[PDB]
Amino acid sequence: IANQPVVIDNGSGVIKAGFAGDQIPKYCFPNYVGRPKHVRVMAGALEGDIFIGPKAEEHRGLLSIRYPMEHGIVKDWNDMERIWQYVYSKDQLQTFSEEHPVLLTEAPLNPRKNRERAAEVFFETFNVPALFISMQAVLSLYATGRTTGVVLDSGDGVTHAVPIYEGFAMPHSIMRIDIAGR
Amino acid sequence: DPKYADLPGIARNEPDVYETSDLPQEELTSTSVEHIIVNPNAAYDKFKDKRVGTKGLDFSDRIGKTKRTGYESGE
Numbered sequence: 181i182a183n184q185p186v187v188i189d190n191g192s193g194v195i196k197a198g199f200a201g202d203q204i205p206k207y208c209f210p211n212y213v214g215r216p217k218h219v220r221v222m223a224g225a226l227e228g229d230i231f232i233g234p235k236a237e238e239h240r241g242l243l244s245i246r247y248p249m250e251h252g253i254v255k256d257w258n259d260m261e262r263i264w265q266y267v268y269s270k271d272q273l274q275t276f277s278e279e280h281p282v283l284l285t286e287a288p289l290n291p292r293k294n295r296e297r298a299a300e301v302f303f304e305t306f307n308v309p310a311l312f313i314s315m316q317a318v319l320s321l322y323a324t325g326r327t328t329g330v331v332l333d334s335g336d337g338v339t340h341a342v343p344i345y346e347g348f349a350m351p352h353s354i355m356r357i358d359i360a361g362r
Numbered sequence: 363d364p365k366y367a368d369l370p371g372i373a374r375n376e377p378d379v380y381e382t383s384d385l386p387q388e389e390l391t392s393t394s395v396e397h398i399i400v401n402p403n404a405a406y407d408k409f410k411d412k413r414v415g416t417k418g419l420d421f422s423d424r425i426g427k428t429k430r431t432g433y434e435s436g437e
């Protein structure tokens with residue numbers, strides 16, 4: 181039988197995460213792949229060789245940050261796993277891949293191969309019971325409650341004019357320009 | 363003394379060893395120093411249990427894979 185899903189709001193630049201029914205994504209931090217830049221010497225010098233969050237802010241110019249999300253389109257799938265592991269950790273999820281259903285966000289018309297790659301992760305390495313990944317604009321429409329709506333929204337290195345109306349799939353009218361604030 | 367007795371020219375009443383009667387930090391006290399002991403055994407036992415892994419921490423004019431880091435392995 182299923183469990184409580186986890187509302188994980190990703191994005192080209194910032195990831196948001198909380199469980200189902202919550203009002204606040206309890207685990208928010210941007211989308212980044214950090215790992216050290218120096219020669220570790222003394223004892224107590226934090227191992228893991230990949231650090232996120234307080235360690236990231238704590239070691240800003242000490243950790244080489246990476247952004248494989250080429251306008252959201254990521255390439256360090258292994259590091260994506262580890263990002264989720266950071267979430268999976270006692271820090272954010274404190275659970276397993278099977279202990280909870282997953283919810284995830286998807287930008288429009290991305291290469292399907294990426295999605296499938298993530299599915300390989302989510303159901304082979306990670307073992308998601310049930311999930312679904314789709315348009316963030318749709319979720320924003322749920323928040324507004326509107327059904328008829330041209331959603332203008334931009335990620336961090338992605339811009340996307342999304343003319344929607346009552347869930348009607350209008351990909352010809354719907355656009356996206358993968359360039360933004362990044 | 364017996365030599366003094368047997369030698370005629372040797373006079374006496376001589377205080378032989380004639381002598382002269384001779385008669386007999388702040389840096390820590392500054393407005394800003396805090397000289398503190400680390401409590402060697404306390405801090406030692408603290409960091410002692412903190413294992414350190416290493417795996418060929420090699421650096422001297424070694425070319426290949428530009429970035430390097432000491433104490434490579436984990437423990």
Ligand SMILES: Nc1ncnc2c1ncn2[C@@H]1O[C@H](COP(=O)(O)OP(=O)(O)O)[C@@H](O)[C@H]1O
Pocket residue numbers: 190191192193194195333334335336337361
């Ligand atoms: N006040 C702000 N001004 C400009 N840019 C911001 C601000 N707050 C967040 N951002 C950037 O804009 C992006 C937010 O748009 P969103 O669609 O959430 O992006 P993403 O899809 O990249 O998470 C964030 O990734 C962040 O880098």
